[PDB]
Amino acid sequence: EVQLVESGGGLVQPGGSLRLSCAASGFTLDNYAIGWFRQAPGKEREGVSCIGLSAVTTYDTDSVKGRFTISRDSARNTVYLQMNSLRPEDTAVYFCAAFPYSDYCPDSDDFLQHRGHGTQVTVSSA
Amino acid sequence: SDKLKVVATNSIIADMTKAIAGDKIDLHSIVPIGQDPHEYEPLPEDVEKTSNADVIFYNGINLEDGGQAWFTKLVKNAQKTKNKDYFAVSDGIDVIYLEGASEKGKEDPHAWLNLENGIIYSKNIAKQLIAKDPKNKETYEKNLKAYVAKLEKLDKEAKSKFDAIAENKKLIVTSEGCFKYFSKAYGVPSAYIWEINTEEEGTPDQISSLIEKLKVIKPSALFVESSVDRRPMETVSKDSGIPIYSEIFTDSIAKKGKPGDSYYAMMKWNLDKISEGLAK
Numbered sequence: 001e002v003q004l005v006e007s008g009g010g011l012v013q014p015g016g017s018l019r020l021s022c023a024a025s026g027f028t029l030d031n032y033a034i035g036w037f038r039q040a041p042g043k044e045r046e047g048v049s050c051i052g053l054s055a056v057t058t059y060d061t062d063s064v065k066g067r068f069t070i071s072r073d074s075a076r077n078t079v080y081l082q083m084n085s086l087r088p089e090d091t092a093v094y095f096c097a098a099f100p101y102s103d104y105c106p107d108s109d110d111f112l113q114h115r116g117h118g119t120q121v122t123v124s125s126a
Numbered sequence: 127s128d129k130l131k132v133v134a135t136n137s138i139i140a141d142m143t144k145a146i147a148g149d150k151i152d153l154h155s156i157v158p159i160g161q162d163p164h165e166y167e168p169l170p171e172d173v174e175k176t177s178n179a180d181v182i183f184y185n186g187i188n189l190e191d192g193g194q195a196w197f198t199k200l201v202k203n204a205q206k207t208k209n210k211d212y213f214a215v216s217d218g219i220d221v222i223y224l225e226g227a228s229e230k231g232k233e234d235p236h237a238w239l240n241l242e243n244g245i246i247y248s249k250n251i252a253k254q255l256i257a258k259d260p261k262n263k264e265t266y267e268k269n270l271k272a273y274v275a276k277l278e279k280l281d282k283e284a285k286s287k288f289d290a291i292a293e294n295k296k297l298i299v300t301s302e303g304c305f306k307y308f309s310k311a312y313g314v315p316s317a318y319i320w321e322i323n324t325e326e327e328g329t330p331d332q333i334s335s336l337i338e339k340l341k342v343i344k345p346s347a348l349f350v351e352s353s354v355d356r357r358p359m360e361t362v363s364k365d366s367g368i369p370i371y372s373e374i375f376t377d378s379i380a381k382k383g384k385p386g387d388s389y390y391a392m393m394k395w396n397l398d399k400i401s402e403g404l405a406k
């Protein structure tokens with residue numbers, strides 16, 4: 001029933017910023033943590049930002065701390081990822097996922113039940 | 127930067143510390159997720175982390191302390207000083223005592239299932255974090271203010287959570303008698319197999335004394351804690367026909383990203399699952 005749809009990705013110049021959105025079209029969204037994750041070719045899944053059901057924010061990937069910020073608009077049932085100073089190493093499919101009755105997001109070795117299709121972010125100069 | 131080295135005895139206290147400190151400290155939790163925190167053998171990493179810690183937090187009130195208890199031995203071997211090196215985060219709560227005759231009036235440690243006591247725990251933690259790491263005092267007070275406000279809102283919700291249940295099926299049944307503070311704060315009586323985890327866990331007489339109570343007062347659900355063996359309550363579920371509606375969180379939080387993976391989340395889970403279970 002929990003449905004998540006991302007938006008806001010694409011081709012972006014190195015150094016620039018991008019804001020991703022995660023639109024939640026299930027309900028009782030206030031009782032879920034929402035995490036942003038990414039998957040780059042040949043790498044493990046990284047949880048890059050998380051906001052828990054209590055609104056606490058956590059950042060499980062050191063290489064994006066200070067550049068990424070997660071926020072929740074409860075009225076809109078949307079979670080935003082603000083990415084800054086983007087690097088070639090940030091190129092990945094970015095996807096959001098929902099975790100019922102959680103304040104935190106799983107580590108890479110945990111399975112992931114409710115997630116969106118994902119949105120490509122490619123950091124390069126065309 | 128040279129972060130403060132903190133050690134907490136279990137995952138509940140560690141999570142409350144994390145809610146106050148964020149990523150500003152170096153935090154070690156001794157009792158692993160899902161394990162009983164009343165009796166535990168520290169590992170070499172635990173003894174080492176405890177010796178090097180700048181501040182140690184424990185529950186107190188007869189959870190891990192007292193004569194020959196595991197934490198007492200730990201801090202005595204490390205030559206630590208009470209209220210200089212290690213602090214009972216329960217200081218200031220209104221203690222409730224064990225009722226069984228064999229427990230000789232000892233304290234019941236499970237204060238944190240009353241959210242107002244969770245607020246007291248968090249204030250004690252923030253006090254010592256600020257006193258020993260003043261450079262991060264601004265973060266500590268901002269997190270403390272925000273966290274206490276969230277716990278207060280959940281406490282308000284807890285005080286009305288069971289108003290639709292008839293005072294004939296208001297019975298929280300768990301394996302350990304760990305709900306005394308919850309029962310007192312929120313007006314839902316509780317029953318158990320064994321009163322505290324250090325007793326024998328699931329003897330014929332315990333199970334039968336509970337089954338007789340489940341004949342007088344007959345709730346729509348039983349619950350099993352994440353940190354106990356399920357077999358005694360499954361037996362109680364057999365002989366009573368009452369289903370185990372869900373697992374609940376008492377002595378441990380869950381793993382990161384699972385339901386109940388923080389103090390706040392485990393209490394929201396408990397409030398929702400217990401009220402939904404008792405209404406079925």
Ligand SMILES: [Zn+2]
Pocket residue numbers: 164236302304322323377
């Ligand atoms: Zn216990």
